[PDB]
Amino acid sequence: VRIRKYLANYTQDPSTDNFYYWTCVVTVAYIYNLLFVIARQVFNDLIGPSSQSLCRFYTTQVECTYNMLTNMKEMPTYSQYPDLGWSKYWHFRMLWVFFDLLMDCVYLIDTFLNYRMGYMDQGLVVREAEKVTKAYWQSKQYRIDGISLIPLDYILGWPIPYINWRGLPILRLNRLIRYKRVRNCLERTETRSSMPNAFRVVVVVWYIVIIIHWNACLYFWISEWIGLGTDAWVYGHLNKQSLPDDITDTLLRRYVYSFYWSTLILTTIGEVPSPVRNIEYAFVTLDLMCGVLIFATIVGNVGSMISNMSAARTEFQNKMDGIKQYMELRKVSKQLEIRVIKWFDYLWTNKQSLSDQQVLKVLPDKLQAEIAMQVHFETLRKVRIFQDCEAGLLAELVLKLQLQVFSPGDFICKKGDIGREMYIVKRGRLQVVDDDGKKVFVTLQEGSVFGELSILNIAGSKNGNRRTANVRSVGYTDLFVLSKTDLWNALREYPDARKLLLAKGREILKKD
Amino acid sequence: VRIRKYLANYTQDPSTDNFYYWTCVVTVAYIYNLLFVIARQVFNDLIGPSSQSLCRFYTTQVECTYNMLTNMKEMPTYSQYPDLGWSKYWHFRMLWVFFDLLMDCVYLIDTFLNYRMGYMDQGLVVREAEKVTKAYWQSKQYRIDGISLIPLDYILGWPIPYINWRGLPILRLNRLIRYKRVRNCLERTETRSSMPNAFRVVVVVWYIVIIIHWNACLYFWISEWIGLGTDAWVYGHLNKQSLPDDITDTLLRRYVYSFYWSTLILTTIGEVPSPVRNIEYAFVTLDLMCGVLIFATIVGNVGSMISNMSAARTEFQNKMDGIKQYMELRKVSKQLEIRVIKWFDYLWTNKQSLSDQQVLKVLPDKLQAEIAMQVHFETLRKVRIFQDCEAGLLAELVLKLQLQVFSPGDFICKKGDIGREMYIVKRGRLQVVDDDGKKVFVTLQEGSVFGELSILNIAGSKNGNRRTANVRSVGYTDLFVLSKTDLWNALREYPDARKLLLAKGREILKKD
Amino acid sequence: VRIRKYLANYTQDPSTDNFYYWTCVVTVAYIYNLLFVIARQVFNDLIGPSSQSLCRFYTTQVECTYNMLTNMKEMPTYSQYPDLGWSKYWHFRMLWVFFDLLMDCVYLIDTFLNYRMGYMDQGLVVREAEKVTKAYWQSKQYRIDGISLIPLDYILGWPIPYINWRGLPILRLNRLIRYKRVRNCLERTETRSSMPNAFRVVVVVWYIVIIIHWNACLYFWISEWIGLGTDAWVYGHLNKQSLPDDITDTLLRRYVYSFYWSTLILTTIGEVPSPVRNIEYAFVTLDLMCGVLIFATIVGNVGSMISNMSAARTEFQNKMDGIKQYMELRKVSKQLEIRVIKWFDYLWTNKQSLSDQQVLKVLPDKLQAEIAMQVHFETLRKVRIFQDCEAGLLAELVLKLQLQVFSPGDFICKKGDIGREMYIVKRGRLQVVDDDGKKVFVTLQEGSVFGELSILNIAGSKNGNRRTANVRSVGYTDLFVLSKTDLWNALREYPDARKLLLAKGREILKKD
Amino acid sequence: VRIRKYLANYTQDPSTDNFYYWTCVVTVAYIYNLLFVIARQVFNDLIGPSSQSLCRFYTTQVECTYNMLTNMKEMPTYSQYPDLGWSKYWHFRMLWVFFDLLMDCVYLIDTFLNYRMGYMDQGLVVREAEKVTKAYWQSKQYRIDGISLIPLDYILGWPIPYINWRGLPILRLNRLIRYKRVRNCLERTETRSSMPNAFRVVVVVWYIVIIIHWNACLYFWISEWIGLGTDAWVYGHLNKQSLPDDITDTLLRRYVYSFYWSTLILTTIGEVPSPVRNIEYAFVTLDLMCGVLIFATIVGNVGSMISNMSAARTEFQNKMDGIKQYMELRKVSKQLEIRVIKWFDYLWTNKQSLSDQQVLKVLPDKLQAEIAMQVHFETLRKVRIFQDCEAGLLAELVLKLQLQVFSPGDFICKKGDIGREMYIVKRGRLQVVDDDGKKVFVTLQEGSVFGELSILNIAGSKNGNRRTANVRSVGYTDLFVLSKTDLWNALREYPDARKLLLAKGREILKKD
């Protein structure tokens, strides 16, 4: 009663996390097919030899031991089993059948979830069973789902002794049409990964191994079709690189040498025997060319994926080289040169180089505002004008605060310079020093606001546009820099902050 | 009567589609020449052996069977036919002559179309016979047309028995001067292709095969000039890679081994016998160097052509990595981090990432306006101000509408925030919720307009610059964002839309 | 009397063309030294054998014929000549001495020109003998000039029989310090070249050959120091790749095999015998590593130099692919899609794609104005307002004219649209059509001005800001587009053009 | 008394130069470990053979001479020493122990400096012992410091005869965890280097050698584990490339051949014997793949590091090619073309191409102002308005002066053109010529100011906006170009400079 209702009214939401784990499960079944269907077609002892080897021994033909598959002057001749080896290797073949049925159950569950898959209508996922089933039926998706599930390998994919049918494991290649779920899994995996480049490198290493594996099966398929041990390019006793002295011909040897051959050919090292026949020349020429073009792309990418792991450092280093080269040409003094270099060094050890323009550039301004208001929360909690006034002021200004770094001696404001900006202390410590020297009057910590007196337009005192005091950085200071125009936009829109700023500035000026 | 008049007053328009198909036809003739002229010069059994081979047999010289061209301890010595083999291979040579004459008829028709080719005078094609023929005569094009048609290969390009002339198929290389039509065909083919990168890859694969083919003919030409089977670098019985044991020396073998040799040399694999003579050292050194430099360019391009197949994804992935790296450093909360990541995920599954700036950047603004008015036609058909007013409003505004994506919970307008933009719903659904919570008052679907009350300047009510209500996104919303300045430009130019907007806003405000 | 005065008061101007030809002459002497000093040190039979070879013949030692330097079971042993072969090869050695003295005369003339070389003081070249000689003496240039001329190879660089001195041609390597003149020659050659990329490719091909040549001399130097024919890596009879069967050991063979060896090692093909001794392992390891790193840079550049030969086409093709991909996603109609594609096709066949932003970007505005006024001279000669008024108008406006391309049907102005620009016809033909259809009133050719009526502010008629007529492009039109703001700047500065434009517009409007 | 107090209250400042030299010292100890720990594990005769070799001689076993390790038909069998060779090689082992203890003392001093390391609190370094020690204890740094110092190689890393313990030098690999100090040393070294790219190339060459060295030890470890001289891939007498004829098996030979093997495998040259066993196939396949991927990245970088050594020249050359290509298409006259080319040539020989935008872009405006005021100090000392007025004028303007280069004939101001800029002469010489020709009235050297009369707004004379005279460049001139808007900002803020400029202009105009 419960199961019937639940499956009757079930509908899948594609944007969950359980669905992501499910697509990760489907990728495992896809990789299973991708490797082992071609493996079992070409190396057909993966299910069980299905024939005995019958080496000629010295006189008469006997079944081969491992000592007879070593240093052999001839290849063995196979004699089919009466039951195609089902009595001997039914356990191997039932393991294979179990894993095949398991991956096909994965495919069936994926087909059901496709049949009941919610879709986005207006930003919202439609999760009504009738709508999702109709959208499935009119989406031509049942074609891909059905072609990928035709159980044609259960009939003709296994050795049937009565018909003397040898099996065609390649009939299971129709499972490889569900590549879209696998492609979506990898994209969502790298979109969710905290180590995106490491995942990309792992995925490309998987691509390389799958390519070399399919090419190994290609090489051994062609070797077996031409005939093993017939010339010195084909795997066999005449190759002498595949079967040296004291090396036994086994199923592991056939795959190991084929994987090695494909590695050397696809990387265009080519330290493998040369073709003997026209068909082998055609195969090897086409294969080397694929290897050149194809591993070009791939290996080129891998080096570029391992570039971008360090590209912020490279941009920093280009700017820094450009500045050093400028300063050495123009013969700038060494004091100023080391000051600039130390500024860059500090700006690097604290990772403030350029890591705001990305968020600024691509995100929507409300997301940028929320991120910035969260990152600088403890700093902007101390700011007085922000703490007790309208909050729209805080938001509108928070998007318009530039962060600048000053050196241990720099003067942020000099007593008669010009008033264009106001500053909020993000880090560091400053001093309002007496004119020309010591006698520090007050000290400014994080959260302090200074510089408004000039860019406000109080009618009270004479200077009007000039700095009223000197402000000297004690160590390295990080300051928010708010322009005069931005301040006045946000003030003409918010009267209470204007009144507070003007009153405090008026008091400071009256006290002189 | 009809044919004479038609050809008398015919003139070609180069910008048709039939002319594009014609240039595609000319490319086929060009490729025919490109491959088979050098093929027939170097491998001169393509027209027929023209001499018998005369292997020494055991004693006396007899004509070679295929069993005598296998495992040979010496190369055969050729004895010319009395009639240069015309009696035996007249059918092969007449097939070759037919295809030569067919491609030369293609060249003649192309020359006529060049003679009668219209040209652009003032954006218009001139299709007066007198003008086009004069422009042809004064364009030095008859030089290229004539040099490429000198029928010098019909006299001296075939075996003439009486003169004991062996033939010079290389005299047909003057046909290879019409490369400009072929270059224009490929450029127009990739400009018309819906799969531009696939076509580029196919064209480069053709370039590679033609280069390896010409180098194969070069290698066999040099081998034959030096003398076949004279050392172990030259094709012959001493090479032992060209002619292994049980391999017959045939015309197919000579081309297969030469193509393989050129593949290994031009890709700098070099698993071929080493030069024996100074001339062979010079040839192989020059050839490997050409191979290194030349396949550098080419193979480098192919990897770069297969890069750009996925470059939007790469830009997206760079932005996304930069943002993730920023947020992990600054220790932004995980809720906001997954909100940002889900925003990016949605923005990718719908391909809105950056695919408007291209059309915006390169096209003329009238074309951009027409494309945009067509793409968003069903959306902008619902917009009321656009549906019933002057159409110039729709155009002028349609170029100034930015599209922004909001998340399932975001507030587009909060009751006291600031009015700077107005929004038109492209997708999604919104709600005008009561202050702080539920009690949704109205729902906004695609085509709805909201946000104007603030950026209009109605004198009626108090807020003036503030939002009058809260608008919350239900799911993911795509909104057109029209600034206040753009709205007011288009309104000060169009009075009826201004009156409509002001009247509707006045009613909404009076109802409060 | 004449020569003494002339050389007394002579001073060189470095920016002439004769001086450029002179630096080209100096480059020839530099390349002479670069190749042949190391060639003569390592392959010391370039001046004459200087010893006889003394092969053992069958019994006793006799001088080697060429038939005794072939298939040799041992290397010959050299016995020095009494006079070090001066009697036999004085003609070879006097040819070498003549070319050495000629290149040293080139160096002396270059030293004199350096001693009397004018320099820039204030944009002007100082050509007073006293000043240039003083600047030379205080410039530390006499050091480079003298070190590069020490005639130490005339004493100890040749075989002196009496001292039994064998010669040290390597003492002429001090000539290779004058590389600055050679580097300046190549930079000025590519700055003056009309085929810059072809010259760069030629220069890099020269770099490659010089590197392989020096490495060949390195290999043979090490082979001779270790001892020739001592192992199977060193050039000699045991190598069997350097001296195969029927190959004679000659001076040409020693250089041919060494150049081939260096080609294979520096390109990391490595199809050469493997090292036998620890010193040879060290040499070959260091050499392959240099080859990998060094030919990386070089071959990488060559592919990049052959990229930029086609980079405008690549940028065009990226824009065009981006637009096609946008339009296929958004399902834009096929009519508009082919219109956009044909627009791009035309814009390519006429090379108007982006080839103005370079000149705009890097040049000074007066140079840009002069170039533009020359390029569009025949077009702007027809423009009436430009032909008869102040010329400052023409200049100031000519820098502010954007060129736009319209399609065969496009409407440039529609009767009620908005007036923001004015147009000047660069190419093509337009029509002032009746509203909605035919009845063309007037036709506009190159040089015609239209569109001002709207952006002028005549008080006469009602429209004021609207187009008074429709203007339809007949074929493809190229138009200068002058904004309204630029027009009014240049008009408020120039009253006569303002009066002319206003009067003509007033007449047109009054005639309606 | 002194030492105890000094070490009691000592605290380290990380930003000194002595600390940088200390991190350079620590890098030497790190490289010591990196090379020689694995070297001593794999090639265990680095401390002393510890067993005799016992070659079979002809009959009976005797200790091997060097003549018995040459051309050997079998490998020697080792018989352990009673005291593990401590009596023979105690001097070698005490040298090794001394260097181990020295590097461990370096590690201990580094651990003490970490324990007493100052940190930045607010731009300032905290140098109170209590605070720095607490911050150390709560920073999990003692974990890295302790794991890297576990003296487990002093007990079990050396041959102990009594226990018959052979030694495990690999137990010293825990020292390789202090890679952070080494990474910081290299980054600070390239940030302080005046030759940044040379240092990067040296660092990458070190990376390559360390990788090949570790892979050599890997190869010999696997060869020894499999068994030396057992097949033809393993180092030994059957390899015949490792031990040719007349080559003695020594410790130097084992490392030389292994380094060569790793060079050929990691650079995918592969001219080494092919694997014989499945384990060797697996090793070589994994190794070639690492070599392909890994040397991809590395060698790709090296070519890119040697690119950027010349990237300013490449940008210059791209601009110059673009302009030449534009001018050849549009058929600009040859006089103007050579004028443009000579302008570019001069702009290159003086390195003014684009080398200001870097400093402008990345630095803070106060640093830019200080650099610019220092670079142009001697030029701006001559400027009159700057020399005697408020200094804020000099600063505010100095950031807003663009530098432009004019040709030997160019007219900077023509008598009736328009006044928008003012100029200050940086280099070169100009003339105020009479209208149309000669009669030069005055000459302007470096420091002269001209062009203000037009952009000032004196009411005195008629022209108002026009140039009052012609100014012609004599040779190449470099001028500071100050816009009119910038001049008037800085003048409305500074009254005395305004009065001076207006008075001088008034006098000049009154004198006419």
Side-chain angles (χ1 to χ4, degrees), chain D residues 140-154:
Chain D
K140 317 286 101 182
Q141 175 75 85
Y142 64 100
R143 295 173 179 171
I144 294 293
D145 285 7
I147 300 296
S148 309
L149 270 179
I150 300 178
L152 200 51
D153 58 290
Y154 293 107

Side-chain angles (χ1 to χ4, degrees), chain A residues 376 379-380 401-404 422-426 478-482:
Chain A
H376 311 300
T379 298
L380 299 163
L401 295 169
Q402 282 289 324
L403 245 154
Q404 302 179 16
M422 70 181 312
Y423 309 91
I424 303 173
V425 194
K426 172 61 178 171
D478 304 6
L479 296 174
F480 293 119
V481 181
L482 180 63

Side-chain angles (χ1 to χ4, degrees), chain B residues 139-240:
Chain B
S139 170
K140 317 286 101 182
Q141 175 75 85
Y142 64 100
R143 294 173 179 171
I144 294 293
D145 285 7
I147 300 296
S148 309
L149 270 179
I150 300 178
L152 200 51
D153 58 290
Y154 293 107
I155 323 169
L156 301 177
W158 293 92
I160 313 170
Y162 329 101
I163 327 181
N164 191 15
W165 178 251
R166 261 304 197 99
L168 257 172
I170 206 70
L171 292 184
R172 201 174 212 272
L173 281 191
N174 63 99
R175 311 294 195 281
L176 298 192
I177 309 193
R178 300 211 184 185
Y179 61 86
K180 189 188 175 184
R181 192 72 97 209
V182 180
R183 164 165 53 79
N184 296 7
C185 171
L186 304 183
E187 297 180 351
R188 264 192 300 180
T189 307
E190 76 172 328
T191 309
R192 292 159 124 262
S193 198
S194 62
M195 317 184 67
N197 299 285
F199 176 73
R200 290 195 260 274
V201 171
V202 169
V203 170
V204 181
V205 168
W206 269 88
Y207 285 162
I208 291 172
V209 174
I210 293 170
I211 291 173
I212 300 179
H213 164 69
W214 270 75
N215 200 345
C217 302
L218 238 168
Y219 169 68
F220 196 80
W221 214 358
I222 301 197
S223 318
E224 225 180 3
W225 173 67
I226 293 172
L228 294 191
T230 46
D231 53 60
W233 177 92
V234 136
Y235 176 99
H237 67 296
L238 290 185
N239 197 321
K240 289 301 182 304

Side-chain angles (χ1 to χ4, degrees), chain C residues 65 158 284 411 438:
Chain C
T65 62
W158 293 92
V284 176
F411 269 100
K438 209 191 178 189

